[PDB]
DNA sequence: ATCAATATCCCGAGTACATGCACAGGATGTATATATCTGACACGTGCCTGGAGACTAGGGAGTAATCCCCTTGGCGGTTAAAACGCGGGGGACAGCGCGTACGTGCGTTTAAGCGGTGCTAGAGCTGTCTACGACCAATTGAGCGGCCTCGGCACCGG
Protein backbone atom coordinates (compact mmCIF):
# COMPACT_ATOMS: atom_id res chain seq x y z
CA UNK A 1 0.00 0.00 0.00
CA UNK A 2 3.09 2.18 0.36
CA UNK A 3 6.27 2.38 -1.76
CA UNK A 4 8.51 1.56 1.21
CA UNK A 5 8.15 0.74 4.91
CA UNK A 6 11.86 1.12 5.75
CA UNK A 7 12.05 4.91 5.42
CA UNK A 8 15.19 6.25 7.10
CA UNK A 9 15.93 9.67 8.53
CA UNK A 10 18.08 12.14 6.60
CA UNK A 11 19.41 14.05 9.61
CA UNK A 12 16.36 14.77 11.74
CA UNK A 13 16.09 15.72 15.40
CA UNK A 14 15.03 12.32 16.76
CA UNK A 15 18.30 11.96 18.67
CA UNK A 16 19.20 15.59 19.41
CA UNK A 17 17.16 18.65 20.34
CA UNK A 18 17.51 20.52 17.04
CA UNK A 19 14.78 21.39 14.53
CA UNK A 20 12.68 18.32 13.77
CA UNK A 21 12.11 19.17 10.11
CA UNK A 22 15.55 20.21 8.83
CA UNK A 23 18.20 22.91 9.14
CA UNK A 24 17.09 26.50 8.64
CA UNK A 25 17.52 28.09 5.22
CA UNK A 26 19.94 30.63 6.69
CA UNK A 27 21.94 27.76 8.19
CA UNK A 28 21.77 25.90 4.87
CA UNK A 29 23.25 28.85 2.99
CA UNK A 30 25.83 29.44 5.73
CA UNK A 31 26.99 25.83 5.38
CA UNK A 32 26.95 26.01 1.57
CA UNK A 33 29.14 29.13 1.67
CA UNK A 34 31.96 26.96 3.07
CA UNK A 35 32.28 25.18 -0.29
CA UNK A 36 35.43 26.21 -2.24
CA UNK A 37 33.47 27.97 -4.97
CA UNK A 38 35.58 29.16 -7.88
CA UNK A 39 35.89 32.88 -8.59
CA UNK A 40 33.60 32.62 -11.63
CA UNK A 41 31.54 29.71 -10.29
CA UNK A 42 27.79 30.36 -10.02
CA UNK A 43 26.03 29.91 -6.69
CA UNK A 44 22.93 30.97 -4.76
CA UNK A 45 24.67 34.14 -3.50
C1' DA B 1 -28.99 76.58 87.81
C1' DT B 2 -31.82 74.16 86.06
C1' DC B 3 -36.17 71.35 82.62
C1' DA B 4 -37.77 69.82 77.49
C1' DA B 5 -36.02 67.30 73.00
C1' DT B 6 -32.73 64.48 70.94
C1' DA B 7 -29.37 61.19 70.60
C1' DT B 8 -27.09 57.19 72.34
C1' DC B 9 -26.54 52.95 74.88
C1' DC B 10 -28.31 48.69 76.70
C1' DC B 11 -30.88 44.48 76.31
C1' DG B 12 -33.79 40.88 74.12
C1' DA B 13 -35.40 38.12 70.12
C1' DG B 14 -35.63 36.11 65.13
C1' DT B 15 -32.13 34.97 61.72
C1' DA B 16 -28.31 33.59 58.72
C1' DC B 17 -24.17 33.11 56.23
C1' DA B 18 -19.36 32.13 57.46
C1' DT B 19 -16.27 29.71 60.70
C1' DG B 20 -14.18 25.52 62.02
C1' DC B 21 -13.60 20.58 61.57
C1' DA B 22 -13.35 15.91 59.14
C1' DC B 23 -12.16 13.39 54.62
C1' DA B 24 -9.41 11.84 50.37
C1' DG B 25 -5.06 12.45 48.34
C1' DG B 26 -0.93 14.10 46.15
C1' DA B 27 3.03 16.27 45.75
C1' DT B 28 6.42 18.30 48.28
C1' DG B 29 9.26 17.70 52.84
C1' DT B 30 12.45 14.03 54.54
C1' DA B 31 16.30 10.43 55.15
C1' DT B 32 20.68 8.49 52.93
C1' DA B 33 24.90 8.96 50.43
C1' DT B 34 28.38 11.44 47.34
C1' DA B 35 31.17 15.11 45.58
C1' DT B 36 33.80 19.52 46.50
C1' DC B 37 34.83 23.88 46.88
C1' DT B 38 33.74 27.98 49.98
C1' DG B 39 35.16 29.73 54.01
C1' DA B 40 37.64 29.12 58.93
C1' DC B 41 42.26 29.59 60.46
C1' DA B 42 47.20 31.20 60.43
C1' DC B 43 50.75 34.15 58.74
C1' DG B 44 53.13 38.29 57.46
C1' DT B 45 52.75 43.09 56.21
C1' DG B 46 52.63 48.03 55.81
C1' DC B 47 48.99 51.36 55.42
C1' DC B 48 47.24 54.76 58.39
C1' DT B 49 44.73 56.11 62.22
C1' DG B 50 45.66 57.88 66.76
C1' DG B 51 48.69 60.86 70.04
C1' DA B 52 51.40 65.34 71.09
C1' DG B 53 54.04 69.45 70.16
C1' DA B 54 54.25 74.64 68.74
C1' DC B 55 52.51 78.68 66.21
C1' DT B 56 48.94 81.52 63.72
C1' DA B 57 44.47 83.80 63.68
C1' DG B 58 39.78 83.07 62.20
C1' DG B 59 36.20 82.40 64.88
C1' DG B 60 33.48 82.14 69.02
C1' DA B 61 31.82 84.13 73.71
C1' DG B 62 30.49 88.31 76.29
C1' DT B 63 28.45 92.95 76.59
C1' DA B 64 25.51 96.99 75.43
C1' DA B 65 22.29 99.96 72.85
C1' DT B 66 17.83 99.56 70.42
C1' DC B 67 14.43 99.59 66.94
C1' DC B 68 11.21 95.86 65.34
C1' DC B 69 8.53 92.24 64.98
C1' DC B 70 5.38 89.61 68.16
C1' DT B 71 1.24 89.35 70.57
C1' DT B 72 -2.95 90.79 72.77
C1' DG B 73 -7.24 93.03 72.30
C1' DG B 74 -11.33 94.87 69.71
C1' DC B 75 -14.73 95.23 65.91
C1' DG B 76 -17.21 94.62 61.18
C1' DG B 77 -18.57 91.64 57.62
C1' DT B 78 -19.64 87.09 56.04
C1' DT B 79 -18.82 82.62 54.89
C1' DA B 80 -20.59 77.88 56.68
C1' DA B 81 -23.43 75.20 59.67
C1' DA B 82 -27.95 73.16 61.12
C1' DA B 83 -32.32 71.75 59.65
C1' DC B 84 -36.31 71.82 56.54
C1' DG B 85 -38.42 69.92 51.89
C1' DC B 86 -37.60 68.21 46.99
C1' DG B 87 -35.53 65.08 43.71
C1' DG B 88 -32.59 61.78 41.39
C1' DG B 89 -29.36 58.15 41.13
C1' DG B 90 -26.94 54.52 44.13
C1' DG B 91 -28.25 50.05 45.49
C1' DA B 92 -30.01 45.10 45.18
C1' DC B 93 -31.01 40.56 41.79
C1' DA B 94 -30.70 37.14 36.82
C1' DG B 95 -28.22 35.80 31.61
C1' DC B 96 -24.03 35.78 28.33
C1' DG B 97 -19.40 34.98 26.87
C1' DC B 98 -15.03 36.17 26.66
C1' DG B 99 -11.41 36.27 28.95
C1' DT B 100 -8.00 33.41 32.03
C1' DA B 101 -5.55 29.00 33.50
C1' DC B 102 -4.14 23.97 32.39
C1' DG B 103 -2.55 20.69 28.99
C1' DT B 104 0.61 19.25 25.21
C1' DG B 105 4.32 19.55 22.03
C1' DC B 106 8.62 21.88 20.01
C1' DG B 107 13.06 24.48 19.35
C1' DT B 108 15.30 28.30 20.13
C1' DT B 109 18.50 30.08 23.56
C1' DT B 110 21.73 30.69 27.81
C1' DA B 111 25.20 28.07 30.81
C1' DA B 112 29.23 25.88 30.86
C1' DG B 113 33.99 24.97 29.51
C1' DC B 114 38.70 26.37 27.37
C1' DG B 115 42.13 28.91 24.93
C1' DG B 116 43.16 33.73 23.02
C1' DT B 117 44.41 38.48 23.77
C1' DG B 118 43.51 43.31 23.68
C1' DC B 119 42.46 46.13 27.99
C1' DT B 120 41.51 48.61 31.76
C1' DA B 121 44.78 50.23 36.41
C1' DG B 122 48.52 51.83 39.25
C1' DA B 123 52.36 53.77 40.34
C1' DG B 124 55.85 55.75 37.76
C1' DC B 125 57.71 60.45 37.79
C1' DT B 126 55.57 63.14 33.43
C1' DG B 127 54.75 68.25 32.59
C1' DT B 128 51.63 71.73 31.86
C1' DC B 129 48.22 75.06 33.38
C1' DT B 130 43.52 75.97 35.06
C1' DA B 131 42.05 77.98 39.26
C1' DC B 132 42.52 79.38 43.66
C1' DG B 133 44.64 83.84 46.46
C1' DA B 134 45.92 88.90 46.28
C1' DC B 135 45.58 93.40 44.43
C1' DC B 136 43.17 97.33 41.76
C1' DA B 137 40.64 100.00 38.86
C1' DA B 138 35.45 100.24 36.49
C1' DT B 139 30.09 101.65 37.48
C1' DT B 140 26.03 102.07 40.60
C1' DG B 141 23.73 104.20 44.15
C1' DA B 142 22.32 107.06 48.16
C1' DG B 143 23.26 110.83 51.41
C1' DC B 144 24.17 115.74 51.01
C1' DG B 145 24.66 120.78 49.47
C1' DG B 146 23.49 125.75 46.80
C1' DC B 147 20.43 128.37 44.84
C1' DC B 148 15.99 130.02 43.08
C1' DT B 149 10.92 130.65 43.18
C1' DC B 150 6.50 130.74 45.53
C1' DG B 151 3.48 131.88 49.25
C1' DG B 152 1.89 133.81 53.86
C1' DC B 153 1.99 137.66 57.40
C1' DA B 154 3.02 142.37 59.24
C1' DC B 155 3.40 147.40 57.87
C1' DC B 156 1.86 151.57 55.68
C1' DG B 157 -1.59 154.08 52.45
C1' DG B 158 -6.41 156.02 51.15
Resolution (A): 3.2
Nearest nucleotide from residue A16 CA, by C1' atom? B107
Residues A44 and A29 sit within 8 Å (Cβ to Cβ): yes
Strand B–CB A20 distance below 7 A: yes
Burial class (CB in 10 A: 0-12, 13-18, 19+), A15: exposed
**How far apart are alpha carbons A22 and A10 in whole angstroms?**
9
Q: How was this model experimentally determined?
A: cryo-EM
Nearest nucleotide from residue A12 CA, by C1' atom? B107
Burial class (CB in 10 A: 0-12, 13-18, 19+), A18: middle
Strand B–CB A14 distance below 7 A: no
Residues A45 and A33 sit within 8 Å (Cβ to Cβ): yes
Report long-range pairs for A7-14 (Cβ below 8 Å, ≥24 apart): none
**How far apart are alpha carbons A26 and A41 in whole angstroms?**
21
Residues A26 and A19 sit within 8 Å (Cβ to Cβ): no
Amino acid sequence: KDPNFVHSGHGGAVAGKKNRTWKNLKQILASERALPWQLNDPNYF
